[PDB]
Amino acid sequence: KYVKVQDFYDQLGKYVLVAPGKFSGTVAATDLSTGWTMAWLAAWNYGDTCPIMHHMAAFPSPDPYKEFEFVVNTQGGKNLFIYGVPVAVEDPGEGMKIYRIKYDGTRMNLQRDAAEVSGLGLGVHVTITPEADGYAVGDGQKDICAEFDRETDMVRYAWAFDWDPNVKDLKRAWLDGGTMTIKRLKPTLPGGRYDLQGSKGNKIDWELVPGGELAIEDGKVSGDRPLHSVANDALVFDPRGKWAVASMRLPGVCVVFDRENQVPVAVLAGPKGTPSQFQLVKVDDDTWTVDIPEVISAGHQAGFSPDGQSFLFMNSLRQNNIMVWDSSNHDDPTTWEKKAVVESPDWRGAYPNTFHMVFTPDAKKIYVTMWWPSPTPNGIAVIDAVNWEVLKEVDLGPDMHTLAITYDGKFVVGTLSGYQNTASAIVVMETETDEVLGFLPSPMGHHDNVIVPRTLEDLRISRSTTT
Amino acid sequence: KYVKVQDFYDQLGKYVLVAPGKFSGTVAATDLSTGWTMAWLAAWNYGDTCPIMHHMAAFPSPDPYKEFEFVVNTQGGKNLFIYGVPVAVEDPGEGMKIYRIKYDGTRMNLQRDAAEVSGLGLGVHVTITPEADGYAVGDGQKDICAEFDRETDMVRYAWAFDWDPNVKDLKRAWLDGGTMTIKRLKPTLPGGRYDLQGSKGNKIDWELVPGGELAIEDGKVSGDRPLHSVANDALVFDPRGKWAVASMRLPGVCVVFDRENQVPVAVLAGPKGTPSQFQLVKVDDDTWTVDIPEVISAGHQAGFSPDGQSFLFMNSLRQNNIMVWDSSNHDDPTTWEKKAVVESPDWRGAYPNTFHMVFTPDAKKIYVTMWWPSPTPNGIAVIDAVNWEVLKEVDLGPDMHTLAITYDGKFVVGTLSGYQNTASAIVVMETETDEVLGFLPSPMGHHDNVIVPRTLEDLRISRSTTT
Ligand SMILES: [Cu+2]
Ligand SMILES: [Cu+2]
Ligand SMILES: [Cu+2]
Ligand SMILES: [Cu+2]
Structure with a gap:
């Protein structure tokens, strides 16, 4: 008569969530079928003086859990002054880096900076x-x-x-x-x-x-x-x-x-x-x-x-x-x-504002983000993509950002990101009856999140066709 | 038809998990009642150029949601060079900082380095x-x-x-x-x-x-x-x-x-x-x-x-x-x-080796970690603390770190840290029958964590009396 969090994840299927953390410095792979972070990377590690880690996308892999490849960039300069953190580095690195990163089935290895x-x-x-x-x-x-x-x-x-x-x-x-x-x-x-x-x-x-x-x-x-x-x-x-x-x-x-x-x-x-x-x-x-x-x-x-x-x-x-x-x-x-x-x-x-979107595989629905500045409840609203109207909207929490979808089309999985100083979640939502199944720790301020695709067809609903 | 993780969290009660993340550079606080991260702080923001966020401890607070205070300390120098990670930093700073930080019910706020x-x-x-x-x-x-x-x-x-x-x-x-x-x-x-x-x-x-x-x-x-x-x-x-x-x-x-x-x-x-x-x-x-x-x-x-x-x-x-x-x-x-x-x-x-322990509030049992070099599965032994004998050993996965306990005595809450390049997680076990309830995403490298205690009394089972 005690509830095992593993039962939750059992329902999600074999997918891999990745995300960068903006002021966090980090990028993180999560295994939804268990709840572990597969691996994570702190770019400070690599002498980066403004590791604002920002957008990413991932290559389709025959088995993401064995290995996969991704790309994730950064911001610097006066980017560090624009959130609510009272940062102290007056003169940051410039970012604007395009990292190449491989998860090889164990860990993430920094491959190079593509902008170099x-x-x-x-x-x-x-x-x-x-x-x-x-x-x-x-x-x-x-x-x-x-x-x-x-x-x-x-x-x-x-x-x-x-x-x-x-x-x-x-x-x-x-x-x-x-x-x-x-x-x-x-x-x-x-x-x-x-x-x-x-x-x-x-x-x-x-x-x-x-x-x-x-x-x-x-x-x-x-x-x-x-x-x-x-x-x-x-x-x-x-x-x-x-x-x-x-x-x-x-x-x-x-x-x-x-x-x-x-x-x-x-x-x-x-x-x-x-x-x-x-x-x-x-x-x-x-x-x-x-x-x-x-x-x-x-x-x-x-x-x-x-x-x-x-x-x-x-x-x-x-x-x-x-x-x-x-x-x-x-x-x-x-x-x-x-x-x-x-x-x-x-x-x-x-x-x-509506800054992000993912479709269903069957191009019939879209889930779109609803952004307010704090304290207004941020959420998701669900789009009927055949008749073009809003079906519903769900309130969730501070600072909504990106959305991705399981490739079987079952669960939507977004990142809420505390305006880089407050609450941050992973959110899961089932497509079937559009219910928020709830949230998972995420101590990072994600401006991006994807699920690792296997196929070229999976991409079509990943960071390729939309943001 | 669908499993809500909020059912899981509803059983843990109202405790705040707090943890540093090692080479992550970050410290996170987590609401075990909802799955959210309440707030996180990235030391590099404050000009820390080797934010190996190490040990920490948390002051009793009448209401942790409303506000609480912690101590978390850094390491530096050649501590950078110690783990799997092919770190690339020319001028590490020395570490040895003892930061004071204060969760004000919305964000963390660095108050001081006490060693200064x-x-x-x-x-x-x-x-x-x-x-x-x-x-x-x-x-x-x-x-x-x-x-x-x-x-x-x-x-x-x-x-x-x-x-x-x-x-x-x-x-x-x-x-x-x-x-x-x-x-x-x-x-x-x-x-x-x-x-x-x-x-x-x-x-x-x-x-x-x-x-x-x-x-x-x-x-x-x-x-x-x-x-x-x-x-x-x-x-x-x-x-x-x-x-x-x-x-x-x-x-x-x-x-x-x-x-x-x-x-x-x-x-x-x-x-x-x-x-x-x-x-x-x-x-x-x-x-x-x-x-x-x-x-x-x-x-x-x-x-x-x-x-x-x-x-x-x-x-x-x-x-x-x-x-x-x-x-x-x-x-x-x-x-x-x-x-x-x-x-x-x-x-x-x-x-x-066994480096960490937590005791049940009545004193009759201990929880103790079992750490190994990779690739062998690290674990928790349960100790009968009146008879002084091993009660159960549980496999968990890589690089088990520290343990804290809910103050009601019912849930033990631990961290695994992937030797700083692989899987990392929060682990929840119940102390009724010493079953592992499962895992939560923790993209960090914790060599410490705490539950914010609420009385001088809870402290006897926190980061005071054991490590
Ligand atoms: Cu955009
Ligand atoms: Cu951004
Ligand atoms: Cu020790
Ligand atoms: Cu340590």
Whole structure:
């Protein structure tokens, strides 16, 4: 007549949860079928002076418990001053590192820093290619994103984004529109290397915090080049191959990239009432532009349903909803048209924001995150992806972040992360009747979490297609 | 249809688990009633450049949820280089910090490094005074131990310990016997502060490891003064006041000291084939010696029964046993006589060593760890503490560390630490029928944990009386 916590985990199946801990310094693999941490890694170990450990993604493995590979980045610079911790390192390391890490069935071995190898340092999202032959990072202080080869860790293409405001005052620089340029970067050092590790190429001094467009507008984000920010956040991929979509927060657009031919081919328009798309203009071999008349809202979260037949981009703060296109046509992104929009009283005021999402395998539902600043209950809301409405919402706790799903599609498993100073959990939730089965210790402030995929098809619902 | 983990947690009651994480750099507090981490702190945030977060202890709090205080201490220097981990840090800091931290019902808040206050820095067990008006810290590098004020963090009294060996050859220097000095240690800088923060005082470059007496003997441990080493481990407290007892690892003894009178009063003799005690000789007002014919076996873990009717000391490596004294005469420690010796047929090898214990509140059972070098499964033995015999041994998995108990007596709560590169976990066993209830994620490397106690009474079974 005593309850064994093992009974809990029995129901979860043979999956491996991984997560980085932001100010914690750590990355951690957990075995849901038992409750142990398989392994963990403290990057201070490795002389890293600002081991803000940030986004990660993992390669599909035939047996994750035997071995698997992952990628996880870091932030530095004025990133350390932007949470509520009264940190003491006045002058931190710059981060912007792209670690390569293998769990080999025992432990995690630090393989290298990919930004030393390539010479390109990025510190926001990391995704895996749908072929698992590579991976991608985005970045929001230097506004560059990049697809990298898995073996060589060299950049396959990088794309810089620059904002030229119609009205040259922070106060109107986005609202009153302008023109963004899409700039094909090229190595500048010998052996195909870039010169962009670290705070090198930062337009601003931290990635924007949520509703941070208000902040930079008000002159409150230090950097050399803020009038020039577009704030890239991600680079995600088409389950079907060929395409990748770069996400730009502040001009609320997404730009569709021909990966093999390395060219941009469409710019998807975020805010409800806009067209489907803005017009891509080519200046030369390495420079396109887009004309944005005004910026009604900033965007954040972007990605594809698992069969790629639907593209999503979330409007946040000024508007709060899910903007949705028909990406059905795989041969031609310029034809992707607005298909629906998901609104709800759930999105009450400026907050909550919806920054993260995972689908079900069967592209019928999505679980999406609800973020408030403290103390407002953060939670999950569940999306009917066939009719496009909110089914329900569940309150959970402080500072919701990412979500992942078991590959059998059974349990959702997210990380709540105490605003880097308070309560942090793993949350489990069953897809069947959308009940919160409850929480597991997690003394880390996760901005990322995945479950190790086995198959290429598993990826389609992992950090590849969404963030 | 689905199992909720909250059913599991509902049975444990309202206790807070607190734990440091070693090479993790972090300390975590965990709500056993809900599964959440209440708050965590990453020392690197506070300019700690070798945050090996070691021992800790927690002050009684009327309501832990609302607020509580702890002591947690770091190690440094070549302690970095000791484990599986291919650490890469050019300039480790020295460790030896004694941090004060304060959970305010939402976050932890670093209040002070006390060794900067006192100027004495010690890196091995933390204990809480039985009156909860103070703490004590031991160290086996400097071989100092000291009690501190809670309010001032200033040293009440401090003792230092020197080996003068019979045979001046490292290999023979404990086994053929020797004389141990016990000195009053007295401060050197203005405002009665000590000149002994960080590495100053280190006679060896790291805390010996399990088996570590073979390394020291073997010339394998560096430092200025190995022949002089006694490796003080802890300064643990008589739950009934007056005494504290200083565990000495290489001389296989425990020293018993009058707290308010700062003299030693008794040397207890650890191994099988020794008297209950050896002779104290006063050399002068500040100093004392004891002659030990030969060190039959090194010892380690040591403390009292909750009613301190019993005092205990483990033989480790050369013997593996639990030596028990009749400490019932609280009047006069030199009256204390060995009464029982707990042994079992599977303690006959070098391994496993028993370094930690917890007692049930009524005193009739102990819980004790079974540590091994990988890959052999570490464990918990249950000790009948009226008959003094082994009751049950349970396999658990790698690198068992410390144990604490719920104060209602029903759940034992332990830590496994994956030798700092593999599996780590919190473990819960129930004390009714000594079944293992299972495991919780603990991505850290705990060599300590506590349940926040609520009365001076709970302290008799916490990080006060045992380690
Ligand atoms: Cu994002
Ligand atoms: Cu982040
Ligand atoms: Cu010890
Ligand atoms: Cu330790």
